Amino acid sequence: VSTPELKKYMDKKILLNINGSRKVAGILRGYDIFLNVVLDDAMEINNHQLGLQTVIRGNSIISLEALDA
Amino acid sequence: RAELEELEEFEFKHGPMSLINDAMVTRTPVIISLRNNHKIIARVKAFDRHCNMVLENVKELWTEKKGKNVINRERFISKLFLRGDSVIVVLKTP
Amino acid sequence: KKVNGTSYKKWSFDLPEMSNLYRLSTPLRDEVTDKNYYYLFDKKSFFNGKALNNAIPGGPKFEPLYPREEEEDYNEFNSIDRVIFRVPIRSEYKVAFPHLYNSRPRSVRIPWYNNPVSCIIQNDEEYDTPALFFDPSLAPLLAEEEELILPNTKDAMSLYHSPFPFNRTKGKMVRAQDVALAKKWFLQHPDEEYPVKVKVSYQKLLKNYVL
Amino acid sequence: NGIPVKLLNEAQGHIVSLELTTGATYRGKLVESEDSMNVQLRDVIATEPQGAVTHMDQIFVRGSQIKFIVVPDLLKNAPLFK
Amino acid sequence: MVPPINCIFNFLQQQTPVTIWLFEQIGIRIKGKIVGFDEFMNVVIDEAVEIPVNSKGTPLGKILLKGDNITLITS
Amino acid sequence: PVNPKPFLKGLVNHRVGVKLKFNSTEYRGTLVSTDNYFNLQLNEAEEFVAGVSHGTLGEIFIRCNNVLYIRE
Amino acid sequence: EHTIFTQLKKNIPKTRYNRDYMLSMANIPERIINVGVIGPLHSGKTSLMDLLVIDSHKRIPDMSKNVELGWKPLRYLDNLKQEIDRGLSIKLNGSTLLCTDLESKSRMINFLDAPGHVNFMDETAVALAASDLVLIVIDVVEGVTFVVEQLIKQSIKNNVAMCFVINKLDRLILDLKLPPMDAYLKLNHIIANINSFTKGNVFSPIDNNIIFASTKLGFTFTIKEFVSYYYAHSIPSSKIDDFTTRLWGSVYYHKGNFRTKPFENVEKYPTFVEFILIPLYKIFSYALSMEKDKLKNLLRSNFRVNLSQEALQYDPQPFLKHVLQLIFRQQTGLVDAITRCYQPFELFDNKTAHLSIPGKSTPEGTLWAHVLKTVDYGGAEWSLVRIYSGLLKRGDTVRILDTSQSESRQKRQLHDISKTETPSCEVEEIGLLGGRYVYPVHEAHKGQIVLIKGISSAYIKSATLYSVKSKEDMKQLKFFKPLDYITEAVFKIVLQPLLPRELPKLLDALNKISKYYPGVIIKVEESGEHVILGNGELYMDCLLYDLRASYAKIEIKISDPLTVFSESCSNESFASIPVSNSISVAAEPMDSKMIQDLSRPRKLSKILRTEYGWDSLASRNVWSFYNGNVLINDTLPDEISPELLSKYKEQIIQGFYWAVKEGPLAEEPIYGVQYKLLSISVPSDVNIDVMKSQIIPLMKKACYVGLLTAIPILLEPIYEVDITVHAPLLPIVEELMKKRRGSRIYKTIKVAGTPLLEVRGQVPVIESAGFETDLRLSTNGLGMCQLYFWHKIWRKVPGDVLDKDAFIPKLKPAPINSLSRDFVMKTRRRKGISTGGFMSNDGPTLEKYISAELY
RNA sequence: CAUCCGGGUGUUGUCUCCAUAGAAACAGGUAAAGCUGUAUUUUUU
């Protein structure tokens, strides 16, 4: 019912901890009620980039730790 | 609620939940695969939205196996309820 | 069951009867119960006046209650040429702000300072209407359980608004030598277009009360 | 409504503890939660399932992947319950 | 703000190279072009190609990948 | 323009193959019918054990939740 | 240490929530909402606070039978004899309450009951300063009065989150007897008015900002609260927010589970009216009018609430109140609304900047608190202090700075950019508010407002306390400004004590008064004539009572009430002539708009000037104003830019400051002037200090001369005047206005859906002198006047000062031109400037006033 | 300071109306009363 209040994390670089001990990085662009993240694309954790902009699904997210304070 | 139920029934009759219904009506022996490696050869009794099943004359088939080993075991059960999330593929052997 | 019994000590009613009683009374005890009416006509106010040896044109007067001793004798404070007499500074004031306008207030009670009133009291058939206001600019928890206005409620509100006796639908009983009715007319500040004798009488009554 | 959710909400501001499905315990000031336990924390440590700890500023967490959330003993006394 | 649905729509409009990661499955990925859109994340994807991950290519036709097992999108 | 559900509908009375979650095994059979929840019903279902036809089950009904993808 | 604490705890009401828990919560910020309940006179904010208190506590001590029943209101936060007896709340006595929300997230709330009566805005100001959210309350009936608007404006300065409480539905239901539709319309109108008053935000029942109430009958609610209680049975959890949204506005509901289409068919009664107002009306009618059994049945059915056996036998009004209480439960809705309103902490930073300049905080290294008010809660003097950052433990030795010593400190810091802590304070005990007790606590914490007992000796009125541990910390630190006690004092009174054997006692009491009432400029004059500038009559009276009864206990003489007049000119100056024991200056009357702006970086300043009064670039360059009086000081000759003699200004303007403080005409301050330097004939032999000293007198003299030249005037202040009469008594009011000298009716505002002509006005404070009482008597207890000064609006005292003929009578009031002078002369006499019962005014120097201005 | 003129509250006893058992529940049946309840990403498909 309630929207996830990620207005503090808008336009900030976030370490998205996702399923299977995996990780994604990137600046936050948008979101919705399911927790489906819209972010500008970055590397997968030595390190290598894929894509320009990325849209991560809600269920996959274990965490999204803020790189920028 | 009643209307909704009716609609659901209609859908079942039409779409993918028709075959199962038919089987139930006929009451033939059918095999059911599962998540935990259990081939359930059984007679169908009940049916709902979630693909839960009340089963009669039930014959489960698995393999109790701590390797290296090859054993095939199977047991008879008189009456057995089943949950839908375990089920992957149900098949009717003619 | 509307009383304790034949002792006639406690009484306890329902609404319609009470309303009727109130209506009957109306001619006799129309004491105007907008609290603000009595600004500078409360008992407290009267007391203050008495202890200040000060009047209200309607209100009672007394023997001054302390030794009337002047002899302030014109200091740099309270000279003629220092203070400025723009305002007439009537007695009306001196009691309405006893601690300021009267200097040396011995035994003077703090009075009230209330809000304004806005009401409709009418003797007509229709109820719950905007009579003489100004106009504005521009499922259900109950539907059809009720229609909002009954038949009693026309007078219920009035009763609720009312003076002491009636606002309560129950009570205790009182010696009939009790229950002064003339009281409530002589308290009510009346003095405009009555003859002087009447006014005097009213004043006397007030004095009697007040003491 | 979910009384544990309510409790969690109440705790907001406290130094809560938080273990996931992965088995990684966090401990820190709770910032915000929702109907679904979509937690945030501040000044939070992060224990790896194997052992090693890692400090971090602002974590967000998703309730579905949260296992159990430890609240301090103060909230036992009052006042959500009755 | 730019919602996920909106993003998906944009991608569809574009018909650009998309690289999907599978849920609870690290070793396999998909790479194609978005054709469809649904109320859920479920979308139909023509010109798809399966990829074993560098811990190359493999043959794969036209596919609709179900919404529940998605992880990544990019376009 | 082509959404998934309509594609699925179109693909009725035609060949399809389905992949599964844990212990992944491909299928191959002619599609009988489908619904909004994506539960499937196939005829002549061959079992591709990672691209190896193990057995022919025939007339089968696939539950939606273990399914990975649909292919010709 | 412990025993005493226990004893203290014992002497107090036991609370429904646990106090320990509250204390614990108060450790953690974001769980402490500081709210100031603030409104017009008799909004019923105190009453509301009382309700909250009641809800909180198990049983309250002085809560008698009658109050319980619901006849007399109980104001638990009246406290003091003054207030109990007066009918007005008269100081800031709030309280601290752990409250749950709709969805019970417990949160501790520092509530503060501001007084409504205008003459105590001091207290309101203090509340605002303290509080980060401000519960505005409004009387439905009197509507959004000017006062409310003013408050809103002044709260958007502060700045603060504005939760509104529309109190007195009961009065539109019962007194005005509005049809429900009519009531709804009225409410809408009120909301619109509120919005208009506001600049940025929008207010409505949706989005939890309005809170509808009636404290007499004892129920507050928000739409959301209502929905929670009595629209969760009927609807699923998904479509509840939507429903709520639908509820407000031009929206209708024709039969359909669960639609609800905006507009429309056959019958009227909108969604709001339908699902709320109508219900309320029904409740009222059944509560009063219906047979009891049926009502009970209804309440069992529709609301799921049970009338007890005793409650059935209550008298209507009390009974009604009880019913309402049963319906709308212990007021969590209000709390929820408050929570929704407060952002939070987006605003907080801004607010703190406003109070104490922008910059950045320092948490662990140093604690800082705003000593806000000194008060007398439990007899002894406490200090209500908001700890802004850090945590202040019992017995800690603490720095202090009265907000007089604030600007200076800042300046010093700037200049800087051996250790020297000027005063100190041992914190003897600390506790919470309030109502009728201090709950004593060891730790003060960042966020919470608390009464501290050691804090007093050093400070008066307002202060900053802190505890630094370094030079860096000190540097970081900022100091709060003095509170803009919105109304600003005007109304004068001169004390003597009757038996001057006890002048000392009076002095002692006077200090206390100054501390305790913080809107009290108490000037001690040269001639033993101790002076008190109150906000106004009532406030002054209250203060007098406090002094003459409690804080002194002496027979204390009291002058007829005066006002401070101030010195300004009509024409411009005509001859800058210097003085010697050598500078000459001359002044122009400033533009009205500019003055107004003043009342409410050089390039920037210039730009501002240009925007305001159409001033040129040179003019912009020259200026350097002072005091917040206001006067403007311009360096506008020819030679000054080449000259470095006119350079080094910081010293030069001291004289100007002095002049502004104490004028020529009355030693009564200067106002509304643009001063212009025309010549500064400094000699060759400097001796710098001496020169500076000379300038300090000389500048003042020059200013005086300029004023004299400029056809100077005393300015009276004016009271802006609310009058809420019954419509047909407006003629009476008009007549009354006519009767006195100065007065004016700007606009007769018809209040929506009442008989009340809110007839705003202007009245000179001097000719007020109990005006309120006069108004009330004449208008037979109708139209509560209110007089005030928020605007800081001054005006000409009619006619020409410096005319020896003037007037006829001594004891009587003087005519208007004549009065121009009379006041001035009397003021002079009061000061101790003139010599005699007959005297005059004239300004040296020199040359016989330039040969009487060349004849 | 006191004097009347009135008043509650309980402690009791006495006079006129309304009552009316000498004990029931276990195990669950019958009948009523009092509250609690439709799988596609965050809980149970």
Ligand SMILES: Nc1nc2c(ncn2[C@@H]2O[C@H](COP(=O)(O)OP(=O)(O)OP(=O)(O)O)[C@@H](O)[C@H]2O)c(=O)[nH]1
């Ligand atoms: N009709 C009506 N009267 C009310 C209502 N609320 C309060 N009052 C009455 O009006 C007066 C105002 O209540 P208070 O709480 O004393 O007002 P206040 O907010 O303290 O005003 P200040 O004294 O200026 O602080 C009281 O005598 C109450 O009985 C209301 O909702 N309706």
